[PDB]
């Protein structure tokens, strides 16, 4: 799940209790990640680990 | 904005992308304490 | 990516498509394309029945 | 700060409506008014849903903490699978051929809807009958020895301390309080039922799970047999009534009258304040008011993405452990009536309706229809307007709040029709 307030991921310190992950269904992580890879590496090779 | 496009025999969508600055600072003062501050400008929190 | 994702419906056979919105500041630029409704799952909700 | 517009000073209002869930079409596309997400923005020109990223800022220097005057309004039926009021176990006879009987516990189910304390009792016995009309009459057991039967009237008002029989020849037709008649080797289970409180039967020590009440426990509460009226010319008296129209023996303990005149029908109401108050039933139970609502169970409220963790509560993401902000009592009320028609309307209702469903045995003085008690109480969903105390707020309230309404067992209550809150934040103390 990404960009979904319905199932927003949590990542905060037990003592803090204040979630550090603030997502908005307006953003698009999925696509963002894609383009990112095509700019740092050769998006033609394959890598099973990350499928 | 006014987009003129070719007609298609099926429902479509106009995917727009208002390139902005989606940045966030992470501050860790003490052990087991994460304080973050997001800021996407323009379009801070929707438009109204 | 750094950009706000917007989605406006385009009725079948439609040609013109206006979109009103206003920015109080200055961004970076525009970027756009076209997608098919059937191939675009309605996000935000934990499940799309259609 | 409202991110845009101009910021406002102290004494502001942030409303959390249920009329906003339809517009958020993307978040509550699975949950119904129990844990939906709302936009506490309300700008008025930015289309339905928007401002998901925008946050309603509050200063770093001082923390707020406003009231919370919510407006709840449910519509929960009297009986439903949710509150565990539809089912209720009860060991009844299964077969009896060649003196080869048997008893086995069977879970019963009641339809959703029907209310009224009297109507529910007739339904509890109606379930007893349908069980017999599927397993009973096909195997061996007669219509006479039907185990378990809820009543309401006192079976010892006409009893005389000499003869030991109900001199009227008929049990007094006037309900007092509901109970549970039992036959040899048969009881009712109420470990997983709230129908027990409805009858007006609570344990002195509710903290101990297991509300079993067998026939063996109802010692010293035998129902006094009727007197043979048609055979009273000068002598007879001692001779109790055995049969009647259609011929249905009352199941006497034996032929004698000494230590016997009694039948094999243990009563709960007789065991209470007529038994021996030292080792009887009156040691672990208690004669309480009926109360249709079954219990004064109080719901929980919470708003994780806005109100601070109340003292010892901890942050997490699950609808079964949200940080409660304040508790309210469920908006279900009792509505006292008064039907003088009762008992007299019973004699007429048998004609209003086409078929005697409840009153299948209009002959037997024990397996009849329970006399309709005076002052019927019905549930009435009243829209409450509570007054919650001051609650601290976050450092930066979210755009899309999460209004949750937890129950007693920590879970959604699919009977919420209205659920809105108003918050009026104000400064408390600086750092």
UniProtKB/Swiss-Prot annotation, chain A:
S-S bonds: none
Swiss-Prot/TrEMBL induction comment: Expressed in the late phase of the viral replicative cycle.
Location in or out of the cell: Virion; Host nucleus
Role, per record: Major capsid protein that self-associates to form 240 hexon trimers, each in the shape of a hexagon, building most of the pseudo T=25 capsid. Assembled into trimeric units with the help of the chaperone shutoff protein. Transported by pre-protein VI to the nucleus where it associates with other structural proteins to form an empty capsid. Might be involved, through its interaction with host dyneins, in the intracellular microtubule-dependent transport of incoming viral capsid to the nucleus.
Family: Belongs to the adenoviridae hexon protein family.
Subunit structure: Homotrimer. Interacts with the capsid vertex protein; this interaction binds the peripentonal hexons to the neighboring penton base. Interacts with the hexon-linking protein; this interaction tethers the hexons surrounding the penton to those situated in the central plate of the facet. Interacts with the hexon-interlacing protein; this interaction lashes the hexons together. Interacts with host dyneins DYNC1LI1 and DYNC1I2; this interaction might be involved in intracellular microtubule-dependent transport of incoming viral capsid.
Note from the entry: All late proteins expressed from the major late promoter are produced by alternative splicing and alternative polyadenylation of the same gene giving rise to non-overlapping ORFs. A leader sequence is present in the N-terminus of all these mRNAs and is recognized by the viral shutoff protein to provide expression although conventional translation via ribosome scanning from the cap has been shut off in the host cell.
Record-given protein name: Hexon protein
Organism annotation: Bovine adenovirus B serotype 3
Residues of the full protein shown: 305 to 355 of 911
Curated annotation (Swiss-Prot), chain C:
Protein's cellular compartments: Virion; Host nucleus
Induction of its expression: Expressed in the late phase of the viral replicative cycle.
Family of this protein: Belongs to the adenoviridae hexon protein family.
Function: Major capsid protein that self-associates to form 240 hexon trimers, each in the shape of a hexagon, building most of the pseudo T=25 capsid. Assembled into trimeric units with the help of the chaperone shutoff protein. Transported by pre-protein VI to the nucleus where it associates with other structural proteins to form an empty capsid. Might be involved, through its interaction with host dyneins, in the intracellular microtubule-dependent transport of incoming viral capsid to the nucleus.
Summary of subunit composition and partner proteins: Homotrimer. Interacts with the capsid vertex protein; this interaction binds the peripentonal hexons to the neighboring penton base. Interacts with the hexon-linking protein; this interaction tethers the hexons surrounding the penton to those situated in the central plate of the facet. Interacts with the hexon-interlacing protein; this interaction lashes the hexons together. Interacts with host dyneins DYNC1LI1 and DYNC1I2; this interaction might be involved in intracellular microtubule-dependent transport of incoming viral capsid.
More info: All late proteins expressed from the major late promoter are produced by alternative splicing and alternative polyadenylation of the same gene giving rise to non-overlapping ORFs. A leader sequence is present in the N-terminus of all these mRNAs and is recognized by the viral shutoff protein to provide expression although conventional translation via ribosome scanning from the cap has been shut off in the host cell.
Entry protein name: Hexon protein
Biological source species: Bovine adenovirus B serotype 3
């Amino acid at each position: 799940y990404y960009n979904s307030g319905g199932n927003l991921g949590v990542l905060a310190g037990q003592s803090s209790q204040l979630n550090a992950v603030v997502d908005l269904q307006d953003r698009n992580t999925e696509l963002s990640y894609q383009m990112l890879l095509a700019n740092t590496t050769d998006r033609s090779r394959y890598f099973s680990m990350w499928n | 904005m006014t987009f003129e496009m070719d007609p298609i025999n099926e429902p479509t969508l106009l995917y727009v992308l208002f390139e902005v600055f989606d940045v966030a600072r992470v501050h860790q003062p003490h052990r087991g304490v994460i304080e973050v501050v997001y800021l996407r400008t323009p379009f801070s929190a929707g438009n109204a | 990516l750094s950009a706000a994702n917007m989605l406006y419906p385009i009725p079948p056979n439609a040609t013109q498509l206006p979109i009103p919105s206003r920015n109080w500041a200055a961004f970076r630029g525009w970027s756009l394309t076209r997608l098919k409704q059937r191939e675009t799952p309605a996000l935000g909700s934990p499940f799309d029945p259609y | 700060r409202y991110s845009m517009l101009p910021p406002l000073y102290d004494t502001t209002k942030i409303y959390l409506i249920d009329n906003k869930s339809s517009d958020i079409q993307t978040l509550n596309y699975q949950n119904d008014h129990s844990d939906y997400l709302t936009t506490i923005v309300q700008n008025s020109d930015f289309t339905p849903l928007e401002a998901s990223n925008h946050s309603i800022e509050l200063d770093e220097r001082s923390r707020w903490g406003g009231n919370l005057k919510t407006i709840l309004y449910t519509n929960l039926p009297n009986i439903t699978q949710h509150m565990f009021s539809n089912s209720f176990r009860v060991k009844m006879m299964a077969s009896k051929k060649d003196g080869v009987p048997q008893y086995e516990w069977f879970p019963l189910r009641l339809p959703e809807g029907n209310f009224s304390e009297t109507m529910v009792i007739d339904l509890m016995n109606n379930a007893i009958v349908e069980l017999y009309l599927a397993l009973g009459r096909q195997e061996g057991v007669k219509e006479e020895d039907i185990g378990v039967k809820i009543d309401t009237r006192n079976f010892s008002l006409g009893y005389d301390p000499q003869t030991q029989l109900v001199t009227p020849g008929v049990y007094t037709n006037e309900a007092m309080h509901a109970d549970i008649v039992l036959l040899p080797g048969c009881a009712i289970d109420f470990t997983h039922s709230r129908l027990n409180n409805l009858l007006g039967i609570r344990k002195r020590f509710p903290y101990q799970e297991g509300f079993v009440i067998s026939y063996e426990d109802l010692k010293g509460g035998n129902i006094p047999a009727l007197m043979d009226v048609e055979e009273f010319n000068k002598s007879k008296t001692v001779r109790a009534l055995r049969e009647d129209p259609k011929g249905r023996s009352y199941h006497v303990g034996e032929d004698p009258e000494a230590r016997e005149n009694e039948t094999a029908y243990r009563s709960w109401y007789l065991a209470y304040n007529y038994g021996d108050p030292e080792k009887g039933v009156r040691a672990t139970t208690l004669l309480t008011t009926g109360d249709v609502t079954c219990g004064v169970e109080q719901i929980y409220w919470s708003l994780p993405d806005m109100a601070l963790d109340p003292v010892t509560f901890k942050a997490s993401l699950k609808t079964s452990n949200y940080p409660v902000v304040g508790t309210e009592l469920l908006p279900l009320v009792p509505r006292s009536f008064y039907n003088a028609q009762a008992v007299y309307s019973q004699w007429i209702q048998e004609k209003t309706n086409q078929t005697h469903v409840f009153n299948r045995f209009p002959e037997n003085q024990i397996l009849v229809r329970p006399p309709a008690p005076t002052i019927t109480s019905i549930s009435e969903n009243k829209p409450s307007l509570t007054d919650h105390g001051i609650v601290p707020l976050r450092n930066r309230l979210g755009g899309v709040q999460r209004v949750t309404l937890t129950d007693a067992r920590r879970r959604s209550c699919p009977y919420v029709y209205k659920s809105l809150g108003i918050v009026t934040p104000q400064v408390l103390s600086s750092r």
